[PDB]
Amino acid sequence: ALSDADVQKQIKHMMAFIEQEANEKAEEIDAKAEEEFNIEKGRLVQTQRLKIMEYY
Amino acid sequence: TEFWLISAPGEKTCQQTWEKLHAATTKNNNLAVSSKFNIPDLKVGTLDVLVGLSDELAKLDAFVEGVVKKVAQYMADVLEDSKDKVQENLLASGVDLVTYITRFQWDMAKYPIKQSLKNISEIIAKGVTQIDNDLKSRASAYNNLKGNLQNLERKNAGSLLTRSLAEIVKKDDFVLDSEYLVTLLVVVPKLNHNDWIKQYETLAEMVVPRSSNVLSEDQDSYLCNVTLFRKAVDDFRHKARENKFIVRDFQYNEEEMKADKEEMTRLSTDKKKQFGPLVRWLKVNFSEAFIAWIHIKALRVFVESVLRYGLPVNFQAMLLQPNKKSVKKLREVLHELYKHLDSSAASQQEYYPYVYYKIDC
Amino acid sequence: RGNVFLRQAEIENPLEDPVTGDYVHKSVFIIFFQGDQLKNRVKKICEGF
């Protein structure tokens, strides 16, 4: 039940919800970026450390 | 008890006091009991998944409604200090039911809003389901106990023809260490008790004479017996059944009758001892369950309000208790007071211009 | 519960229904929504009517 402009107002609801989903995506993407550099760091650090110790 | 809950867009900050006692948006001219609901604030989470979330939440709400009504029905089927008719004043966690719906308390510790609202709904489902399974087990076990009592009383129910003679006769009433004889307990009614005491000699042969000694006399038929040869049991029964001499071969046993009676007394005392705590467990199960139910009802109302009103979490609701037979006048007045909220599209049927769900007995 | 604009148009000279034969006036009042659940149940309903 919306006038010719309240339809657009609640469309700005739905678009701000797409924005909230994009912000949740940004938060989870950054958090998984944090997790991923940690994981890849652990992996490659272990590989390099192992190679150095075997050579030693 | 019937109770109403209405939510609104909340376009003005004066609605903080209008939730309590507005005069212009009063109900029944400041006569209906109105108090602002203890409104929390929760995250949005989703909207595309939210419609189906609210639908399945309504299905689960009907499910838990059935669960709590089933708990109340069972506690009434206990039929002692808790019934649908008498002693029905069962307090909501030690506080009166009306008093707790009017003073509902909302907590974050049990159910963090930071989690998904689906997470909370499924945790509620898990808890209520464990309660329900424990309730089915409790029903089976304790009603089996009550049925054991009832069936042991069924063994204590009936005339002496079907009721044991543990405390009526003695071990010596028959011939212990019989040579070739059997003290057949041919119970004869009172219409014919005076006849066997003379006919016993002729009713069979190869028997013990002077076997006219009666044992006991009962309202339906007089207990009595007669001693006779093992093969002659057949002949005496066939001759005596025609003169109204009912045959009932009773066996005496002190040990087994005593054991059965001791089992009966054990079951009675243990049943009281299990029945007290049974009421306690039923009370706490029903207790935690309705508090979860009022919480989940408030959650569904919140979800519907967020669906309808707008991106802000600015919304304003309140309980409502109409006076009887004036709630149609409220239907009209609140239609007027809430139609200007929409002012366009929303026949009505169930899609009211306001938010509402009904709570009842 | 859908809140998106309305692509409005009208059909004149309503060619008969393909399968029955009814020359009855028609129009379109179309709206788009994002929810997949809506794309299920709304379309189920319209097929129903």
Please compute, for residue B43, the number of CA atoms within 13 A of its CA located in the half-sphere on the CB side: 16
Closest CA to B40 of B92, B111, B95: B111
Q: Which residues of A touch C (CB under 8 A)?
A: 2, 7-8, 10-11, 13-14, 18
B285 close to B90: Cβ distance less than 8 angstroms: no
Rounded to whole angstroms, how far apart are CA atoms B166 and B152?
A: 15
B75 close to B289: Cβ distance less than 8 angstroms: no
Closest CA–CA distance from residue B309 to any residue of chain A (Å):
9
CA distances from A25 to A28, A37, B44, B46, B268 (A): 5, 18, 14, 12, 64
CA angle, B246 then B251 then B256, to 5°: 140
Chain B environment of C36 (Cβ under 8 Å) = 48
Rounded to whole angstroms, how far apart are CA atoms B45 and B60?
A: 20
Neighbours of chain A (3+ CB pairs under 8 A): B, C
A20 close to A14: Cβ distance less than 8 angstroms: no
Method: cryo-EM
C46 close to C2: Cβ distance less than 8 angstroms: no
- Provide the H-helix boundaries in C1-49: 36-48
Select from C37, C39, C40, C42 the residue whose CB has the most chain B CBs within 10 Å, as the one to mutate to test that interface.
C37
A15 close to C34: Cβ distance less than 8 angstroms: no
Beta-carbon separation of B311 and A2 below 8 A: no
Helix (H, G, I), strand (E, B) or coil at B114: coil
Kindly provide the resolution of this structure in angstroms, with one decimal.
4.4
Q: In Å, how far from its chain's centre is CA A19?
A: 14
Closest CA to A19 of C7, B311, B351: B311
B313: number of Cβ within 10 Å: 16
Closest CA to B94 of B297, B291, B296, B287: B287
CA angle, B116 then B120 then B121, to 5°: 110
Rounded to whole angstroms, how far apart are CA atoms B305 and B342?
A: 14
Closest CA–CA distance from residue C15 to any residue of chain A (Å):
32
**In the structure encoding, which two tokens stand for residue B112, read together?**
């963090």
Chain B environment of C2 (Cβ under 8 Å) = none
Sole residue written with tokens 């069972």: B74
CA distances from B13 to B18, B79, B180, B314 (A): 9, 51, 105, 9
**In the structure encoding, which two tokens stand for residue B345, read together?**
């599209």
Closest CA–CA distance from residue A31 to any residue of chain C (Å):
26
Helix (H, G, I), strand (E, B) or coil at B176: coil
Residue C36 sits at the chain B interface (C-beta within 8 Å): yes
